[PDB]
Structure formats: C-alpha cells, structure tokens
Amino acid sequence: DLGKKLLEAARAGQDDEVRILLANGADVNTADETGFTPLHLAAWEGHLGIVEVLLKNGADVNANDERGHTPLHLAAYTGHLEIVEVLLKNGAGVNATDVIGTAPLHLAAMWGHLEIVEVLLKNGADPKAQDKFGKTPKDLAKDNGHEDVAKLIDKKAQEEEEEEEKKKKILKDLVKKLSSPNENELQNALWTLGNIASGGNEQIQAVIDAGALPALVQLLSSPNEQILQEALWALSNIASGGNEQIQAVIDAGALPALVQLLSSPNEQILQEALWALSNIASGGNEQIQAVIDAGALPALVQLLSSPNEQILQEALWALSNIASGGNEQIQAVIDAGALPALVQLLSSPNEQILQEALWALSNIASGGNEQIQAVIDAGALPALVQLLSSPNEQILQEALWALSNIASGGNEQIQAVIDAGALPALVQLLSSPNEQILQEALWALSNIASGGNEQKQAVKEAGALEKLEQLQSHENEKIQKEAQEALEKLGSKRKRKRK
Amino acid sequence: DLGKKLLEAARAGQDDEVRILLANGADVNTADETGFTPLHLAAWEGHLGIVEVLLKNGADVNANDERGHTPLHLAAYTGHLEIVEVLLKNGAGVNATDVIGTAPLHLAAMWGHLEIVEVLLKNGADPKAQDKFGKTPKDLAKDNGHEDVAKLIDKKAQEEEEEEEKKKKILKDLVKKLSSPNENELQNALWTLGNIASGGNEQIQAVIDAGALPALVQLLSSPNEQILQEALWALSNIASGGNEQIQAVIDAGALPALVQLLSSPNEQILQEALWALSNIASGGNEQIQAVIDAGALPALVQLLSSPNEQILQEALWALSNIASGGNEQIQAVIDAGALPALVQLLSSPNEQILQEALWALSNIASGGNEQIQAVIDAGALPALVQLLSSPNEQILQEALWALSNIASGGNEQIQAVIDAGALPALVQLLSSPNEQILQEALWALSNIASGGNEQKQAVKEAGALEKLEQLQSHENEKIQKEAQEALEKLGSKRKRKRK
C-alpha cells in the first residue's frame, strides 16, 4: 500500500521516504478516509520541505477534504508562515472556503497570526469575506481580542484607498498636462501615459477612464512631429487592449486622423499610424468594419508596394488583422486588390514579410468558397505548395495553415489544391519530426479527404493510407484520433489575430 | 487431510466417500507427489460416476501430471470409451500432449481401441500429430498390428472428400437432366436446383461449379413459360449470393435474355426477370455496370409508369440497386430519365411505392454534387419537405435519408434545401420520441451546418441551438455526441437483395 505509506511518511516528516515512495509510484494525491492528502498533512504538521516536494511531484494545492479544507486552511491555522508563503506561491486558493464559510484569513485572524494575515491580504485575501456566522476576519479578530490584527486590517484598507486616490490624482494631472502650452511638459506627460498604457489592459482602462482619449486624439493633429509620434504611440498602446477599449479609441475619433497619416511623408509617423491601425483591427468584426469604413484598405494595399521593409511588414500585419473575422471584411480586402501583392510577396527573400503575407493569405482563405476561389485565381497555390519543402518550421506551419484553409472549401477548390501537387509533400510531412507540423499537414489531408470520390481516391493514390494507419501508434493520442477520422473519411474557420 | 482421503476414495471407487469428502472441504484438484488428481485416478480405474462427480465439482478436465498426462490420456489408454466421451464433453484437450509428445490418439491407436480412436478423431484429434520418435497414431497402429485402426484413420481422412464427390455427382445428374427432352424431368431438376440455390451461398457455389449456369441461360429461351419462370427463379436465387457468383451469372451471358424478357407480355415472367436483374445489380460496380451496358435502364424507366404495382416496385428496386455504388452508374440512371418519374412517384398513394421511390432518390443523391444538383432540378425538395411532416415513420426515415444525402453536397445545394423550408420541420423533428428519426433529422441538420457561414446562420435562426444543447443529455450517447458535433460546426446509399 503506497498510498497509506505516503500519507504516514508525509505526516511524520520523512522527506527521503516521501521522495522514494513518489519515485516508486506512490500517488502524490493519495487521500485517507476524510480527504486529507499528504499535502494536507505536511502543511498541518509544519514540514515545509515535504510540502515543496509533494507540490513538485504533482500534488494539488487546492485539494478539498470532506469538509472543504485546503492545505492553505491548515497552514493559516497552524501559523506556519513559510508554508503559507509557499502554498500561495504554488496557487493556493487564498479565498477558498470550507463548508462553514471559513477562509484561511478567518483562521489567521481568529488566532492572531499577524504575519499570515498580512501575507494573505497581500496575496488577494478578501478582507470582507463573511463566514457562515456573518463574521469577517476582522470580526473574528475583534471577538477574540486581537486588536493587532484588526488595526492591521484597517491599515491595509487605508493604504489601499490612499494609493488609489494618489494614482487617480496623478493620472488626472497627466490628462490635464496634455493640453499644456509648454512643449516639454506635455511631451513628458505623453510619454509617461504611454508607459502606463503599455502595462496591460488594466492600466489602459485607468488611463481611458481618466479621460486621456480625447486629448490624445486632439494631439493627433499637432504640427510638432515629436509630439505627434508620442501621441500615436500612446494610442497604439491603449488599442493593444480589449475590444471595448479599442472601441473607446474608435469613438474618440482616431481612425480618420490615422488613415490620414497613412499618406504621411515621415516614415516614423507612418509606422506609428500603421501600428495603431493594426492594434485597432485586432478587435472584433465591428471594429474591423469601422477601420474599413474609414478608408484604410486602399492606403494599406498601396503601401504594399513600399520599399521600406518595416512599413511593408506593418502594412501586411494590418491587412491580416482586417482579413480576420467576417467574410464581408475579407471580401473588402479582396476588392481593394491585395491578393496580387500578397502572392508576389510570397516569393520575397525577406522571411518576415514572407510569413506576414502567408498569415494574410491564410486569414483570407479562412473565408467562404468565394474568397478561397479568389485566392486560387490569384495563383497562390504554386508558391504555397513549394513552401511545403521549407526547413523553416514556422514558414512551413504558415503554408500549411493556408493550404488547409484553402482545402476547407468546396470540391472545386480541393481539386485546385490537388492539381497543384500538394499531396506528395503533405503525405511526406505526415511523418515529420515536429508534431505541430505533423498536425497541420494531417488537418490539411483531412480537409482534402472531405471532398468527393475523386479527391478521396487521389489522396489514396498518393500513399496516405499507410502513414495514416501507422499514426495509430503515435504517442500523441490527439494525432491518433485525427488520423483515424481521416481514414474513416477516405473509406466512406480557423482564424488568427495578432496585436 | 481431506485431500489424501479424496484421492484414496477416487482411486478405490468410493463414490459416496468421494462426494462426502468433497462436501467436507476436500480440494477436488488435490494432486499427489506425481501430479495425479482424483480425476486422473477415476479416469484410470474406470469409475465413470466418480468422473462425472469430480467434473461437476470443478475438477480441471485438463489437469497435467509431472509428465504432461491428462485424464483423457489415461482414459484413452485404458479403453474406457464412456469416460473418454464424458471427458471430451467437459472440455478435455483432444490434442493435448505429454512430455514425449504422446497424445490420447497415440494411446488409442497403440492399443487397438477402435471406438476411442473414432471418438477422438471426431472431436478434432490431429491425425498427423507426431511424438518424440516421429510416430503418428497410424504409425503406432501399424507397428503393433492394429490394421483396423489404420483403416479407421484412413476413413476419417477420406469421408469428407467422398461426400463432396457424392454431392458433385448428384449435382451433375441434375445439370444433365436440365438438358432432358421430357418436360417433367427438367421441371423437377429445375425446382430442386432452385431450392438448393435458395439454401445459401455455399449451395449457390456448389450449383455454379456443377455447371448449371449455362443450362439455365439456355433455358431462358424456352417456349414453356413454366420452365422459363422456374429458370428465372433459379437465376435470381443464385444471384442473391456473393458478387463473384453474380459475376458468374453475368459471364454465363444471362443479362441480354433478361433485358429482352423485360418486354414480355407475361407479367409473372416479367416479375421474375426484374427480381433477377435487381439481385444482379445489387453487386459491385462491375456487376451494376454490366447491367447498365445490357441496356436495362430504358425498360426500367418505362416500367416506372406501369399500372401493375408489383412490377413498379420491382423496377424501382432494380433502379435503386443500380443507383448504389459508383457515381458513373448514378449518372447513367439520371441520363435514362428516371428522376422525373421518381419525383412523380413521391406523390404516390401506395406507401410501399413511396418508400421505394424515396430509396431510389436517396441513392441517387448519395453521389457527387452533379447528381445531387440533378435531383434538385427535378424538383424533389418540395416533395421531400412535404414528406417530412408525414405521420408514417418509415417514409419519414427515408425522406430524412434523402435530405441528409442531398445536404451532403455543396453550399449551393444546402442553400437550395434551406430555401425549400426544411429547417423548421427538421428542428421540429429534432424533438421526436423516435430515436432513429431524431438521429436522422440530426444528421440532416449537421450536414446543413457543415456548409458555409450563411447556412449555419440559417440553422441558428431556426431555433436549432436550444434543442441541440438540450440533446447533450439524451439517453443515447451516439445522439449526444452527434448533437455536440453539430453545435461545434455551427460555432466555427444502401443496397438490398431478395431470395
């Protein structure tokens, strides 16, 4: 019985024996009759080392016993500050509750564990969580006479409120500086606001709520190229966030100025405008259709003939983000004449613009049979098939994306792919060392098998059956499943955005 | 020690003491120093009753001693025919061998136990099993002068082939009578042969090998309508068999005579000829193409407008069987103008003819998008949609078959199906008590979801999502999985014979 041995060893403190039993096959999450794991016991007794060891071997940090107790509950009661620290660092439920609504914070407050109270609050313990008796950690600290803990909680709350108020004050001051007649003052506030907005979506909403969006849009018309670049940077950053925040940027009226700047003669201003547009287009179909209605596609397609490879790369980035989502948007991109430039860029020696044109074409081919047939008519398939032999694994994955999306179409498009000689290289890749490339090639073949009898027969003639059958012994069961589905098909979309 | 007592009782013959000691806790398979169980001893001494008792109490019938001898070895040695029979009936190893490769058959033959040799050979004893000296049971029978046993072994080897030859003689006599100048002899032979052919595929091959096919094809030109009808019956029966046997019937040159008899004024001859043709066309694409090349389709299509409903049914049956298999054959059926007549017969008052026309249209729609579009242009979809609300469950399953096959086509055909108003009625049927009808309608909805985004939108607007999610809890797990697959899709031909 390795489970009982592991439970007892963890409870006693035999680190070496715990390691041995786990190495020998002892279930690291073995529980006794009440749901207490060796991790519960280690946290309870105070065996920090065994806690770490068990967590390293796959112990569930939030395992609930029959009463709903977690190892963190136990650590918070006992007063093992270090174990509380480790468990919280390993993902312990700081606000996890038992059957009577007692959370580790309640325990720490009942017994006056000041250190653990502070740690739990710092790791996200809700100070106001009530238990089955309507008692908060502060309530229990007061009822048990722990003035220290109650004042500590009050102090944490006061510091939190003070920091919130100071942060709001500074952000409002920055939004005010944005309208300054002093150049350096406003330029500094611009840069710092951009920095805040680049910390993630949470910071972005702070800036937006302070009211920086309209001020930034106003600066977009400035004649000071330094100021203008700084404003564009801040806008692109805040548009890197959620789709609601992108829509806020759009409502502020940024798109007209941006599409205007697309015709800018200053390469840095133009790069910043393209960045902003692309981050905007990473949103939903509504934001993308807004970008289209602003008249951006003509200028982007025009910029596809740019000699500056960074501007070209960014224009391809934007076109891809717009070609994501709906078929009306993809058709808009097609109507603007982007496909010729994209197929041309498929033969570019620059691998980055190559991957970008591939990403754009894969997105365009994710649409309907109309858009896929337009990709085919533009002559994309020769180059895509040629790219199947690439040793560059990411470019190969890109070409496979595009080919499986083209093969998601009707029998006519699947026949266009087969006539392009894609099957030998696909069956070959089917035995590739890289599992993601194998999966992509298998998806492609599977969407090919979904055609008529002509296409299924062609796949058979290309020698796919043997390798598909061999894949049944693949260690990865997902590949087994997809290959079996393909076999049954013979014997009878996916879009990507980047910010 | 109850085990030793049981051994002693079994060897002595104390039946009552054997049973008693077994009741007192004696192990029925107690082995002594040599590996001999009470069953070994009972078989060796000749205590049939004790053998039965021990085997009924769980005695291992194939227990081996230190030399590999089983109780069957011992019984075959001693000559206890009855004990050998009982042991074999309880699963004794007829080909079990000892350490020197001696099997019970070796023993029975060495000692001239004729009865036991017969029993062992009938139970699968290897006549060619050798022992460590290179001696077969027949070899030992000869070396010890048991000529009787050698003749018995030769007879076991011969008898099966001898009976095969007797059957061949009888079949040759019948095939010869097939060329008799007297009517009655020929009629008797015909009927007896037909019955043989209706006994199953082995009998069919026996008849074919006897050379009956050419005589039957010759008789198809007879002026005695009784003889002709019996010949057609016999050919139909043998064409109910395997596809190689159907191809034998075809090679013998039967199809032209059948196609001629199709214009016969004898309705019973015509019914038998159509039955034979449908059985032939039930085979593979080679047989169906043979039937097509014989020029049968014009007469079948013509018979679709027949007043005799039995003849109409059989013509639809043949056309359906042709419409199975390959798309070349389905196209042949389309070119013969069968789709108009089938679309007409969809409004037939005869429910059987309605199921038959549905089955035909379904097989036609299982092919490629060309054939499905031809079905659509014939105006089938209004009639199929109307039939979706039919209170007849089998006709409904057939209509759903046809619709799920038509919806297997391209996005254009799925849109034609949607335009015919099938979606409300399909969603409605999705709430049917009948699990098979539910599953068929579910297949239909799923093939609609397998189209483009427009079709998925149409399905969503029809209120499919609610019932589809409800179906995730359906008792039938296959239906649960099919409904889940349909949900994921939205958020991104049979043959018949007669004897």
Residue numbers in the entry:
A (entry chain A): 5 to 496, 501 to 507
B (entry chain B): 5 to 496, 503 to 509
What did the original publication write about this model?
dArmRPs are currently being developed as modular peptide binders. In these proteins, a varying number of internal repeats, binding the peptide, and capping repeats, which shield the hydrophobic core from the aqueous environment, are stacked together to form a superhelical repeat protein. Designed ankyrin repeat proteins (DARPins) are another class of helical repeat proteins which have been engineered as an alternative binding scaffold. Here we show how we applied rigid shared helix fusions and the well crystallising DARPin D12 to construct a crystallisation scaffold that exhibits ideal peptide binding on a dArmRP binding surface without interfering crystal contacts.
